[PDB]
Amino acid sequence: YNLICYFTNWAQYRPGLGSFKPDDINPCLCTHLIYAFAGMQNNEITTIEWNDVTLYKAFNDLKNRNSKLKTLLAIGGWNFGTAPFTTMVSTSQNRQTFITSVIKFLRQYGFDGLDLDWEYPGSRGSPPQDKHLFTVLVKEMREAFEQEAIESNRPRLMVTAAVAGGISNIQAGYEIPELSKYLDFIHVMTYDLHGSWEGYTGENSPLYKYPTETGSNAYLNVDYVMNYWKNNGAPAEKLIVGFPEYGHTFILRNPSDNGIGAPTSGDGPAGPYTRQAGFWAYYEICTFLRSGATEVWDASQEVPYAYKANEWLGYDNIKSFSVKAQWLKQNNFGGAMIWAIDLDDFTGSFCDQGKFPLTSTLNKALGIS
Amino acid sequence: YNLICYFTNWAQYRPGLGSFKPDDINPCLCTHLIYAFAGMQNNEITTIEWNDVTLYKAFNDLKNRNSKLKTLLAIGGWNFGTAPFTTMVSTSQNRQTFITSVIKFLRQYGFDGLDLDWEYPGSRGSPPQDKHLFTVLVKEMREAFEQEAIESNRPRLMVTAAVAGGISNIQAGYEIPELSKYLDFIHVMTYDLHGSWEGYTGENSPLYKYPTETGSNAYLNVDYVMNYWKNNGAPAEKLIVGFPEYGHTFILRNPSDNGIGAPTSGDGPAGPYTRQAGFWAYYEICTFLRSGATEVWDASQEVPYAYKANEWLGYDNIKSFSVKAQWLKQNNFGGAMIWAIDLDDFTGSFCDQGKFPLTSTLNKALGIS
Ligand SMILES: CC(=O)N[C@@H]1[C@@H](O)[C@H](O[C@@H]2O[C@H](CO)[C@@H](O)[C@H](O)[C@H]2NC(C)=O)[C@@H](CO)O[C@H]1O
Ligand SMILES: CC(=O)N[C@@H]1[C@@H](O)[C@H](O[C@@H]2O[C@H](CO)[C@@H](O)[C@H](O)[C@H]2NC(C)=O)[C@@H](CO)O[C@H]1O
Ligand SMILES: CC(=O)N[C@@H]1[C@@H](O)[C@H](O[C@@H]2O[C@H](CO)[C@@H](O)[C@H](O)[C@H]2NC(C)=O)[C@@H](CO)O[C@H]1O
Ligand SMILES: CC(=O)N[C@@H]1[C@@H](O)[C@H](O[C@@H]2O[C@H](CO)[C@@H](O)[C@H](O)[C@H]2NC(C)=O)[C@@H](CO)O[C@H]1O
Ligand SMILES: [Mg+2]
Ligand SMILES: [Mg+2]
After folding, report:
1. Is the dihedral of CA B349, B321, B207, B343 positive or negative?
2. Quick one: DSSP state of residue B200?
3. Was B78 annotated as part of a binding site?
4. What φ, ψ does residue B294 adopt, rounded to 5°?
5. A123 CA to chain B: closest CA distance, Å?
6. Backbone angles phi, psi at B192, to 5 degrees
7. Is the N-terminal amide bond of B80 cis, ω within 30° of 0?
């Protein structure tokens, strides 16, 4: 099995003990490390932080302590939007400019492949033709990578993609049978399935549907999403299940209404390290739990939630990671990916569960080490 | 540098190609987007348009397509007048009502700050004490924003203000040294410096005085106005130069008499899209220039003008924006603001200068991207 670990190049700016750089990564935890994110300028891949080249070096130097480790560079992300991708795929010339820039960039800085993280073709302003043009892009990139391996006498660069977990986005965005032939791995973002945007509490990455959920609300679970990809053309062995090392926060309208689906207001509280309304890193979650939050096991969905006064948290812990790892193995998927390793308790000093408690759980469950 | 771009919530009603909504904004052009306008009822901030809530969401979603972007909500404007502001600042209780409503409103709908656009304290019916009480409002708002950020673990809400470019209004309205301490940015409205109200032609935003000017007419240029603010207490780094993406129209009394200072008999006709006598959007100007107008460069003032028969236009183009951008950079000002991005040739269909030609000129000149 593969264990794919995202690292984010803005975690370095978090205060105090939240600051995270590549040398904080244990090189033996994962099989693949993915660097989030590169950007795009004039249809060419580019850095986006002043010290990206330094961090690339430190990142790819982790292979000095694990000969099996592979690294990928991810381009895009949620906050990148769609417009630069739409422009880039709109003409064969723009696609070739981009693919050529990618080959040179990955080889120069030591990466083993590219992770396309366009969120998403055919949605968020991207027009409908981008569903097919994304397939064209991936096909042309796979072919270009095959040719460059011939031309350089090196093992081929990998092409992977992070793909939507929401069914409407999937249907608007991906020609799954053809796309699946050319991608090496498909990183399914089976998280952010519920959040304060819905106006009521729910779990970030529930394995199963809640018992009363019907229709499209029953799409919002890992089991449905992964099986949707599998049964619409993607080989299980290429499908990678998404694991969040964060949870979503909510403000309850009434603290006595604190179950799944309880009404909420506003965007949810922010933590002192991640400083973004609506989510907490796992190490921030540990500070909430240790302060006396009430912990509940959502037995039907195999995930925890917790609440304290009017604060409500839907999250993942060691137990839910263990259950979901067992599930993905028994369903013959290719492994797991984590968003993101810098959100785990990497120092071990917040959760009293050892260093990297969540990532180590998957390392153990998937037989990585 | 900062590039601050106003969007207006009535541009949506323009016919055909003129209809502009937040999704027409290129999220990478500006550093800050300001939503014009909110209103006031019972000393609390409120919506004005039937669909403001939907437009707020689309507007603040632009921050999900550019991780550096900030958004602000502007209150007031020309048509708002002064009476609600005078009542709101008159007592500490009404100011607190307003400030509390603003914090709630901005956090609920996703804005990063408030832009005060009172036109103007101490003028247009506002009594003399509003000069000092405006300072008090800003100080109290800044203090409230600072405390909210601490309690919420989130970046602090900004407070900015659009301020007069006319000297008499400046003297009657602003305690410049104290106000400058508490505002994050000072958006100086270095436009509408001439218009048909004066009875002769003149430029909307000339950089320098015209060679014949010696009286109070010598105040009516960007150079003088910005240096007035700077030399009377405002730090250059907080001062933002106003750039208009529209021009003013005039009817000439004698069409053969068609230079600067030529006699006029009123506003020019409403444009087909903006539909308000006295000005044309830049995209409407490009159509005028293709309709048989003569274009002239006002060399002393670094701006164009144009005329056709009895219609005279004082305006800005790529060249004048470029000259004034070079100037503002040499003076170490904080950047530029644009009134308004919906008046640029956002479709690219009118001027043959690409999409957003005027805004793109400033983005390039200021190194925003
Ligand atoms: C592979 C993947 O999950 N990609 C997306 C990520 O971008 C997103 O994380 C969010 O990334 C933003 C930059 O694009 C950051 O500004 C933001 O803070 C971060 N949010 C969190 C909770 O880490 C993740 C998680 O939502 O999923 C995809 O959307
Ligand atoms: C099932 C579904 O479609 N849920 C939507 C969420 O995915 C979406 O959140 C975004 O999800 C991305 C993964 O696809 C993350 O990369 C991204 O960070 C995340 N954005 C936020 C703000 O958390 C939300 C956006 O409002 O909508 C749901 O409908
Ligand atoms: C920041 C700023 O410029 N604020 C003022 C704007 O209100 C004014 O624009 C005018 O706003 C009116 C509503 O208040 C509209 O009715 C009118 O059409 C609009 N005029 C234009 C040319 O867009 C601008 C420009 O004059 O300057 C300030 O006065
Ligand atoms: C130098 C000076 O004081 N000029 C005055 C103009 O500013 C003023 O026009 C108004 O200016 C505002 C910016 O301060 C704009 O928001 C507003 O739209 C604009 N109004 C119109 C009708 O263009 C005019 C008002 O007649 O008087 C000048 O004296
Ligand atoms: Mg209850
Ligand atoms: Mg003549």
Report:
1. positive
2. B
3. yes
4. -95, 130
5. 13
6. 50, 35
7. no
